[PDB]
Design a protein around this ligand. Structure first.
Ligand SMILES: Nc1nc2c(c(=O)[nH]1)N[C@H]1C(S)=C(S)[C@@H](COP(=O)(O)OP(=O)(O)OC[C@H]3O[C@@H](n4cnc5c(=O)[nH]c(N)nc54)[C@H](O)[C@@H]3O)O[C@H]1N2
Ligand SMILES: Nc1nc2c(c(=O)[nH]1)N[C@H]1C(S)=C(S)[C@@H](COP(=O)(O)OP(=O)(O)OC[C@H]3O[C@@H](n4cnc5c(=O)[nH]c(N)nc54)[C@H](O)[C@@H]3O)O[C@H]1N2
Ligand code: SF4
Ligand code: SF4
Ligand code: SF4
Ligand SMILES: [Mo]
Ligand SMILES: [Zn+2]
Ligand SMILES: [Zn+2]
Lengths: 264, 438, 131, 79, 568
């Protein structure tokens, strides 16, 4: 039902432990799990060379559940392409956590480096630390990126929030920095703090709820209405702005749809 | 007194090839150099020097630096490249395209990280190209057709000196027989640069607000420009409308950009909003963005590694059979910050001088090798300094201009007796590594 | 006081590096602040006098001059090189391009202090300053 | 027939004084070129005026207006 | 030095259908008899052909490098690499579409192909093409300079100087080391430099007042006068729009008064390429059907016109054509990336990703059109197989094309898995079509068609005596074709063996070695024209940024040339 991983040998460089997912851990013997591949530099380690396992995984990823209890703050690629199950990181983390995920949930109890939730397609993330930039951002050179799921960064976010976002939701309980929802097409972003600006640039469609204070509003948004909206909370009486008039707009049946950014 | 035509100046993105050298009787002293700018004149004057490095040089325990043979330096580098766990090879701004192919092969054998000056220079631009595209043109196109010229965040007068007199403004083309007098030049940057002196307009913008400026322009172009605020980025709405009207009426425009866009807030988003503006202008006119690449063959690593691995820069060659690229994770500066390297190889650049000093401090914890023709900061804080020929002066080859047009550079001086060139050197390193059987 | 700052090029600077990174020409060309005349008066900086440029990621003593390329009130400028990169912050914003232009900095008029050469700066940052 | 003086100390070799001079532009850019002599040519990185005896200049100011960092002084008074 | 004993032979140039013949390669060139010191190959029950020849493929050049830069999603997608993971050879293979040079070479070697004709190259950008060719691994390769928007060839076909234009084509070919002539969107690509396009065959170029018809005719006269190996490879006008089958017939009627004169064997006078792109019909994309019937009726009539199909392989791809207006129009349709590279005094360019997915009536009909073209051909020697890689799909989907041709079950399967099957079958004809091209026909239109059309069937494309020893052995037996079309897919995807001028380079589908390659060019020997010399010098002084002495590819930047020489 559960697996316990505990770091025993500290790796001098960063370990690309992509193999640590419920998908690879499901229905495997303890020795097999301990010998799943893991890279480091240009060398490939066996994943029993840096961890000590104690548990019994399930027949299915949707059954199993991994718990990492060490200083895994120099480990990258945890949760990659995780289809179902559960992961817990009782520390902080590094790059690509939950990348290209399609279900399940990652509960990082600490921070996180860049590229958290890159191109995610479902499931949950429950960070309580200060996630860096490119949270939910699509991979370089792509146009259809994040298309579902939930990201909950309970700390200070950074750049490139929800770049080229298509669906789903990115909630940042702290505040943010430049370039939120650029190139986007759909979904929501709920920032609950001060934003430097540049929010909604290049947007074709989508929503960006903000409860802090935009310090540099882009010229491409104009106020059109003051609406009450229950977003993650209750009636906050937002004054919506309409569309990025700088960028072309997709048209629906008999009406042009704008990418409306809200505000407090 | 043996005048040599059609030489290449190996410094700026212009890759000027209209250079005339009057080499001495013995073919090893350069007497007078015509048609080149000063920065170039000095490159040739340095290449033709009499007292120049000829052998490698190693750091002894005492801290001094003594010479060793080429085979010993190749052995040192090969053994270290194999023993390391994630070496990083950086540079390639100033090398022939065979120098950037041999390096790709060497690091394919090794398994480290291969990278160029694109990361710290116009790599934010490539990241935008990946997002939006690169509507561009060759430089003869703007020479022969351009009616409006925009220098957004660039300074040709001091970056690329003979850019204006060769490609953009002053030449009298085919459809621009009237020369400058029918070209409208707009220069945007917070300073009043020498390019702005020569220009006819100037949009003195607050440093860092170029995104708001581009968004204003694009709302004007998309048509309901009345919704602009009174002023944008320090620029006044009537001036915005003036420049936008000129841009709309341009028969064939061209936009150049540089550090004003690739080194400020929103590194790549500035460039991609610029590219979006260009794609929008091509609705009613013809407009072509174009990046002010710096070193001669800095577009050479891009194309060579494009054909070899498919990725222009930030190459993750550690899996040994599939490469990866993510600039935020695989770039030289970020890896130096997160001490994710094991060895730094200085090839065709000056990392010590031109990196942030925290990154240099983080990097020097490991061994450090420099392959340069002459003394510089990297060759002063390295562990061994392997000499190499200079492109365009001691050795010829292909280089790639600002616009990815291959110029063929010629050789004017034979290199000092003993000194080899980087393609021979990198090939010997790869041969020795295969001898060491890894 | 917050005094936003940029780092850029100049022909004399390019000329200097191709003379040599360790040359008096390079020293003269790069160890330079090119700020506004109004800002120089308001801060209290004598023209052509050393000054302490101290950002959050370092510090450097650099000559303070006025530049033809008119910086608007509230802007600074160092020709790129050893001295500028002693004070450039390394933040990349997950793009690999450090904040080479547009970082805040405070400026303190500190004459009677020498300028640090290029070798001294780099080899002392690393810990190799034999001389 | 005026006299132009180029401050060699701040000349960068930009060559925009050579390209922009309308007497230089006579050879290659005219139908049936009349005179093929040239005022400036950038030798060793600085603009050299071959028009030593001040016979071809016409005080146009295209070259003074062209140099990006003013370095060409035009004398309108007899040398 | 080698002999391939007891394998079925299919050599259309010698009319050989399933004979148990033996090929005795001897030092790169096929010879009748070799002694018992030659290492043998027991190819029993395996279909032997000759080393395939590809006539139209963009496997190099500035367009392709611009695509590789612009599109890094191409290599990496959804976490895993769509190019697959493999290091069979001494290097890497990156890229699903527009593969890196090391993947293109290895993938063709595994296909059996041995010659690839890189279609379009701007003449100014010749060192680029010759550099990528040095890095392609085993395939011999030639590139075709583009002469349909050159300003010098706009002047001469304006002023009616056949001799001067011929001297200029010979000079260009000798400089860029090309092998023929490609006209990409005659005239229109230059109007794109101002932002317009030549939407028909008759409208004049801006400021030049020459027309697509005049320029095509002038280049045909030049080509057949010089007797170049390959004909005038032609793109066409009004590409990618409904109703342009009329214009395609109008442009094909431009050859009705010429005869192919040369010392090489070719019956074409012009080669109309990706015709499934030129064979549309109707007004817009809602009243859009197939004109392949009319196009192939005209081609089945005329014997001096040879074609190739641009069959779409129904996947994700980047489309690179040397003409701007088509790519710009496509960008305005689908709102995805777009790259444009205008050359100076020469051509244009355009790179735009595109999704040929199965869930669109338009893409379904586009897929059906190429099959209708190929299955309406009475003579297959004149209709070849390409995909305009990557414009209609990557070349690693050639076996899918061959499966679709050779098995109607495959076509029924694709049409059934297609979304708007009712609309596609209503607006096409491929649903009810029995023809399954035979193995002889597929060998014909894959190996002999392209070689004979290129007019180099002497060395490539056949197993007759004296030819170049390039042989490709396949798994499938010629006596009974496989029941499951996936078997055909695999059989043509992976070759049992492959020999390059006598040296085995692929075994079981696994790369083995890479000896070397040739880069063919044309070596017209003729006295120079003072008039064209003067015009070229004047034009480089006034208009080109590069110099005349640095335009010609240096003698040391070409990789084992082996020219094809000519006279006068
Ligand atoms: N403060 C500040 N710093 C910056 C920037 C900024 O904007 N502000 N910009 C950053 C950017 S844009 C970059 S490009 C860097 C640029 O800085 P660099 O890329 O480091 O450029 P150079 O210092 O001129 O490097 C030239 C060295 O390569 C040698 N060389 C010449 N030819 C060859 C050859 O053929 N082979 C080999 N092996 N060596 C050769 C030369 O002798 C010389 O040693 O500056 C960066 N640093
Ligand atoms: N002599 C010499 N020549 C060189 C070099 C050198 O080091 N010395 N470096 C070479 C190389 S490596 C480079 S990459 C190229 C690049 O050189 P360029 O790309 O042309 O850029 P810079 O010369 O640094 O000047 C950039 C201009 O943008 C202005 N700027 C700063 N911030 C902003 C902003 O926020 N908005 C706007 N609109 N403008 C801003 C700056 O004031 C400056 O005027 O030059 C090359 N040429
Ligand atoms: S502009 Fe650049 S390439 Fe041209 S001469 Fe000057 S330094 Fe050389
Ligand atoms: S004043 Fe006119 S004619 Fe005289 S040198 Fe200058 S540009 Fe030439
Ligand atoms: S334009 Fe000015 S800087 Fe340029 S070469 Fe002439 S005098 Fe010198
Ligand atoms: Mo640069
Ligand atoms: Zn085509
Ligand atoms: Zn094609």
């Amino acid at each position: 039902e559960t697996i316990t991983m505990t770091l025993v040998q500290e790796p001098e460089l960063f370990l690309e432990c992509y193999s640590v997912t419920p998908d690879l851990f499901a229905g495997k013997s303890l020795a097999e799990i301990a010998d799943l591949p893991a890279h480091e530099g240009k060398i490939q380690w066996k994943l029993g060379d840096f961890f000590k396992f104690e548990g019994k995984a399930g027949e299915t990823a949707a059954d199993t559940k991994i718990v990492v209890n060490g200083n895994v703050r120099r480990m990258k690629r945890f949760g990659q392409q995780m289809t179902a199950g559960e992961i817990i990181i009782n520390s902080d983390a590094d790059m690509y956590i939950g990348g290209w995920m399609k279900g399940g949930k990652i509960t990082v109890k600490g921070n996180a480096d860049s590229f958290l939730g890159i191109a995610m397609e479902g499931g949950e993330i429950l960070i309580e630390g200060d996630a860096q930039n490119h949270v939910g951002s699509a991979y370089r050179g792509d146009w259809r990126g994040m298309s579902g799921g939930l990201i909950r960064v309970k700390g200070k976010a950074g750049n490139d929030i929800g770049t080229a976002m298509t669906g789903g939701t990115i909630i940042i309980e702290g505040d943010a920095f430049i370039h939120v929802l650029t190139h986007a097409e759909g979904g929501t972003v709920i920032i609950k703090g001060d934003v430097e600006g540049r929010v909604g640039g290049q947007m074709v469609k989508g929503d960006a709820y903000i409860l802090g204070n935009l310090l540099y509003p882009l010229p491409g948004f104009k106020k059109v209405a003051t609406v009450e909206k229950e977003v993650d909370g209750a009636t906050y009486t937002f004054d919506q702005f309409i569309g990025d008039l700088g960028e072309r707009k997709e048209k629906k049946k008999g009406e042009i749809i704008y990418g409306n950014i809200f505000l407090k | 007194p043996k005048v040599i035509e059609n030489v290449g100046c190996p410094y700026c993105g212009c890759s000027c090839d209209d250079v005339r050298i009057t080499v001495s009787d013995d073919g090893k002293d350069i007497l007078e150099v015509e048609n080149v700018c000063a920065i170039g004149t000095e490159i040739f004057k340095h290449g033709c020097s009499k007292d120049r490095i000829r052998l490698p040089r190693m750091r002894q325990p005492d801290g001094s630096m003594k010479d060793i043979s080429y085979e010993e330096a190749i052995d040192w580098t090969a053994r270290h490249l194999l023993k390391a766990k994630k070496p990083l090879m950086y540079g390639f701004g100033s090398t022939n395209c065979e120098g950037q192919a041999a390096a790709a092969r060497v690091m394919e054998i090794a398994g480290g990280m291969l990278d160029n000056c694109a990361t710290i220079c116009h790599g934010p631009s490539f990241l935008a190209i990946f997002d939006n595209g690169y509507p561009s043109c060759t430089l003869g196109e703007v020479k022969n057709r351009a009616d409006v010229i925009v220098y957004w965040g660039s300074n040709p007068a001091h970056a690329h000196p003979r850019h204006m007199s060769r490609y953009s403004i002053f030449p009298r083309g085919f459809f621009t027989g009237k020369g400058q007098k029918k070209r409208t030049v707009i220069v945007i940057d917070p300073r009043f640069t020498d390019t702005a002196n020569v220009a006819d307009y100037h949009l003195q913008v607050k440093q860092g607000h170029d995104y708001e400026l581009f968004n204003a322009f694009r709302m004007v172009i998309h048509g309901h420009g009345k919704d602009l605020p009174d002023e944008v980025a320090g620029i006044k709405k009537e001036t915005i409308l003036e420049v936008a009207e000129i841009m709309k009426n341009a028969r064939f425009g061209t936009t150049f950009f540089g550090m004003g866009l690739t080194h400020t807030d929103g590194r790549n988003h500035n460039i991609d909003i610029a590219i979006s503006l260009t794609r929008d202008l091509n609705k009613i006119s013809k407009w072509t963005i174009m990046a002010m690449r710096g070193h001669y063959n800095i577009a050479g690593p891009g194309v060579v590694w494009s054909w070899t691995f498919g990725f222009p820069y930030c190459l993750d060659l550690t899996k040994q059979n599939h490469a990866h690229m993510n600039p935020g994770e695989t770039s030289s500066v970020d890896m130096a910050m997160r001490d994710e390297v094991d060895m730094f190889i200085n090839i065709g650049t000056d990392a010590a001088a031109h990196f942030p000093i925290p990154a240099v401090k983080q990097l020097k914890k490991h061994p450090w090798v420099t392959i340069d023709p002459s003394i510089n900061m990297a060759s002063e804080i390295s562990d061994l300094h392997i000499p190499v020929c200079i492109c365009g002066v001691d050795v010829g080859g292909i280089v790639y201009r600002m616009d990815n047009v291959p110029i063929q550079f010629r050789k004017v001086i034979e290199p000092p007796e003993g000194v080899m060139d980087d393609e021979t050197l990198l090939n010997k390193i790869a041969d020795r590594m295969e001898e060491l059987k890894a | 006081k917050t005094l936003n700052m940029i780092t850029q090029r100049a022909v004399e600077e390019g000329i200097a590096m191709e003379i040599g990174k360790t040359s008096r020409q390079y020293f003269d060309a790069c160890s330079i602040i090119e700020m506004n005349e109004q800002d120089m008066k308001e801060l209290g900086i004598m023209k052509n006098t050393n000054v302490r440029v101290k950002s959050e990621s370092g510090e450097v003593v650099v000559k303070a001059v006025v530049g033809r390329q008119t910086c608007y009130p509230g802007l600074c400028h160092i020709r790129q090189g050893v001295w500028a990169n002693q004070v450039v912050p390394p933040r990349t914003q997950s793009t690999g391009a450090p904040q080479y232009s547009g970082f805040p900095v405070t400026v303190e008029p500190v004459p009677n202090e020498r300028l640090k050469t290029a070798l001294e700066l780099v080899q002392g940052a690393v810990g190799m300053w034999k001389g | 027939a005026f006299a132009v003086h180029v401050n060699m100390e701040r000349c960068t070799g930009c060559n925009n004084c050579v390209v922009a001079c309308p007497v230089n532009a006579l050879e290659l850019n005219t139908v049936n070129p009349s005179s093929t002599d040239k005022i400036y040519k950038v030798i060793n990185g600085d603009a050299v005026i071959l028009d030593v005896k001040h016979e071809l200049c016409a005080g146009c100011g295209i070259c003074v207006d062209a140099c990006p960092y003013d370095v060409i002084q035009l004398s309108g008074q007899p040398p | 030095e080698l002999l391939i004993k007891n394998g079925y032979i299919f050599d259309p140039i010698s009319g050989i259908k399933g004979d148990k013949a033996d090929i005795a390669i001897k030092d790169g060139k096929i010879v009748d008899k070799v002694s018992s010191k030659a290492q043998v190959i027991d190819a029993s029950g395996k279909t032997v052909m000759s080393g395939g020849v590809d006539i139209h493929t963009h496997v190099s050049g500035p367009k392709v490098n611009t695509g590789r830069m612009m599109r890094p999603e191409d290599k990496f997608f959804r976490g895993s690499y769509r190019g697959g993971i493999i290091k069979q050879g001494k290097r890497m293979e990156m890229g699903f579409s527009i593969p890196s040079t090391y993947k293109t070479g290895y993938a063709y070697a595994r296909m059996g192909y041995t010659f690839t004709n890189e279609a379009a190259m701007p003449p100014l950008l010749a060192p680029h093409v010759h550099e990528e060719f040095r890095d392609t691994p085993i395939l011999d390769q030639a590139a075709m300079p583009v002469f349909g928007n050159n300003w010098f060839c706009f002047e001469y076909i304006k002023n009616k100087e056949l001799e001067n234009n011929a001297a200029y084509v010979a000079w260009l070919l000798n400089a860029t080391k090309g092998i023929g002539i490609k006209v990409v969107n005659p005239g229109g690509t230059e109007a794109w430099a101002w932002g317009e396009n030549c939407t028909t065959i008759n409208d004049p170029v801006p400021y030049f007042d020459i027309t697509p018809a005049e320029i095509v005719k002038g280049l045909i006269e030049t080509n057949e006068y010089l007797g170049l190996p390959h004909s005038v490879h032609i793109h066409g006008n009004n590409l990618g729009n409904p109703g342009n089958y009329k214009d395609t017939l109008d442009t094909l009627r431009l050859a009705e008064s010429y005869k192919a004169k040369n010392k090489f064997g070719r019956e074409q006078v012009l080669h109309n390429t990706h015709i499934q792109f030129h064979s549309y019909k109707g007004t817009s994309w809602a009243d859009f059907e197939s004109g392949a019937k009319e196009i192939m009726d005209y081609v089945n009539a005329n014997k001096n016109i040879t074609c190739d199909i641009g069959q779409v392989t129904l996947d994700e791809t980047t489309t690179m054509t040397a003409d701007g207006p088509f790519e710009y129009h496509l960008n305005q349709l689908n709102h995805i990336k777009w790259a444009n590279v205008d050359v100076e005094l020469e051509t244009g360019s355009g790179v735009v990703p595109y999704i040929y997915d199965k869930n669109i009536k338009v893409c379904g009909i586009q897929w059906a059109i190429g099959l209708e073209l190929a299955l309406y051909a009475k003579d297959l020697m004149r209709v070849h197989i390409t995909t305009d890689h990557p414009n209609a799909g990557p070349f690693t989907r050639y076996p899918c094309v061959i499966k679709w041709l050779m098995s109607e079950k495959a076509r029924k399967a694709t049409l059934d898995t297609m979304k708007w099957k009712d609309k596609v079958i209503a607006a096409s004809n491929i649903a009810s079509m029995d023809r399954e091209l035979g193995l002889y026909e597929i060998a014909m239109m894959t190996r002999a068609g392209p070689a004979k059309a290129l007019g180099l069937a002497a060395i490539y494309g056949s197993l007759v005596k004296g030819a170049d020893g390039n042989v490709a052995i396949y798994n499938l037996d010629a006596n009974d074709l496989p029941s499951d079309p996936e078997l055909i897919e695999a059989a043509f995807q992976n070759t049992a063996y492959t020999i390059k001028e006598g040296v085995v380079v692929v075994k079981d589908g696994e790369i083995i070695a890479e000896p070397h390659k040739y880069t063919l060019w044309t070596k017209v020997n003729m006295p120079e024209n003072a008039q064209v010399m003067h015009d070229i010098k004047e034009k480089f002084t006034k208009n080109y940024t590069v110099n005349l002495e640095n335009y010609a590819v240096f003698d040391e930047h070409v990789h084992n040339p082996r020219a094809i020489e000519l006279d006068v």
